[PDB]
Design a protein around this ligand. Sequence first.
Ligand SMILES: Nc1nc2c([C@@H]3N[C@H](COP(=O)(O)O)[C@@H](O)[C@H]3O)c[nH]c2c(=O)[nH]1
Ligand SMILES: Nc1nc2c([C@@H]3N[C@H](COP(=O)(O)O)[C@@H](O)[C@H]3O)c[nH]c2c(=O)[nH]1
Ligand SMILES: [Mg+2]
Ligand SMILES: [Mg+2]
Lengths: 230, 230
Amino acid sequence: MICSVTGKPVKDVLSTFFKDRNDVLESEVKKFHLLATFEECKALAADTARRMNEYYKDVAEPVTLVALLTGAYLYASLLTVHLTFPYTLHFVKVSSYKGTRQESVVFDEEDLKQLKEKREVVLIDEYVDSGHTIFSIQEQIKHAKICSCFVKDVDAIKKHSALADTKMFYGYTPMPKGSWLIGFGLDDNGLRRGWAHLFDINLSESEVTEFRRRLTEHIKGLNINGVNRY
Amino acid sequence: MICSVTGKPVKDVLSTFFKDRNDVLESEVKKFHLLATFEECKALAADTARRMNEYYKDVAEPVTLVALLTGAYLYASLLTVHLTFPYTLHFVKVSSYKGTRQESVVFDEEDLKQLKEKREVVLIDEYVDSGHTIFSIQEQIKHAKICSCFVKDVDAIKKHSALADTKMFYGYTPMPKGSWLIGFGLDDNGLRRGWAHLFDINLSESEVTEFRRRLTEHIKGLNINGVNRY
Ligand SMILES: Nc1nc2c([C@@H]3N[C@H](COP(=O)(O)O)[C@@H](O)[C@H]3O)c[nH]c2c(=O)[nH]1
Ligand SMILES: Nc1nc2c([C@@H]3N[C@H](COP(=O)(O)O)[C@@H](O)[C@H]3O)c[nH]c2c(=O)[nH]1
Ligand SMILES: [Mg+2]
Ligand SMILES: [Mg+2]
């Protein structure tokens, strides 16, 4: 029931968060269940930056980092500020096409052409849920690597032979089945992307408590001293 | 000589920033002149959030925020997390077309159609310099408002009758004549966007010292204690 980074009780994090806002009705506040505080998310992103930094410390050409609009902007901002190897960064807009046999990510022809040319290309997304998105991107850019703050089920992803070899840098896994997340850049029907904490609106209290129990112990065991230079 | 937010000697902020990096050579470190620490930039962004929050406290419909790729991703992340009114967020990767008579911003037909329909549209940019970008967007979306962390010369921008009425929210102005900024999302020829502190690579030590004196004066008089809820 306490933030694993600051030590502030979640009730206090939320009392501060919800004080006199103009973007949520008092009656709606209870609908939002905090899964991870913004500070906890920042720790996860820093830990991910740490691993990418170690991986690319000797790279001889800038890495191509590419983030998918729009939600990943926040995570990308929390990740990139801690990276210490050369890279370029750009964002691309893709559309999800739900076919009768599979869901596919449709890129701008030019964007895709450019990416397929780079040796080191890392797709940044804040959340890998069903994995259909990265599964599609993967089959279009076979050498692409993935960097995601949250991954619902890594094992499920690795089950696919196509992704079994793909390098993935992620902050935390697994995420609760039956959840629906908003905040941390993810929209609530277009709104609240800037609600920095990661909230859920579909889980039971017990499920939220269990998720935090596991997240908290994971964060307390992290060693990211020095990663943040600011 | 110190960060106007943390009180830490800039010399130490920089030594911490540059210790064991893999994205700059030792001989190149002196090329970067610190203009504003990441913390100072965060204070300026919080101030713009505070002002936007007051302006839109009674908005009846979601405000349309449009951030200009690529550089605005960091500032947008630092601004949106503190906004307390409803809004949607979109990034536009418009293309700059340098004509023989003027430079114009080319939008995706659909993106432009959508924006021109919304009553409240705010363009988010980390830095408005020559102003050609917003000047173009302005004549295409005449009702667009601007929210920029840094502005080279506000006085100069208002010189244009077309922009003389455009509502502008900004963190700080003016920026040093002849400066070239990198960091805080701005690229150094594609690289270093994640260097969160705002650096310049053209100014003399005395020019930089003078800029920080003025920035310091502004930040110390800043009233944002409370804007950050995280
Ligand atoms: N608001 C909110 N968005 C998503 C998404 C959106 N779909 C993207 C890719 O999903 P997937 O892995 O299922 O293909 C995510 O990166 C995210 O932007 C998945 N799950 C959720 C969720 O619970 N909440
Ligand atoms: N690296 C680095 N980029 C810019 C820019 C980029 N150009 C864009 C628009 O500029 P302007 O106002 O001149 O049209 C900005 O959004 C910014 O990303 C302006 N000035 C600088 C600078 O000094 N340095
Ligand atoms: Mg996503
Ligand atoms: Mg979404």
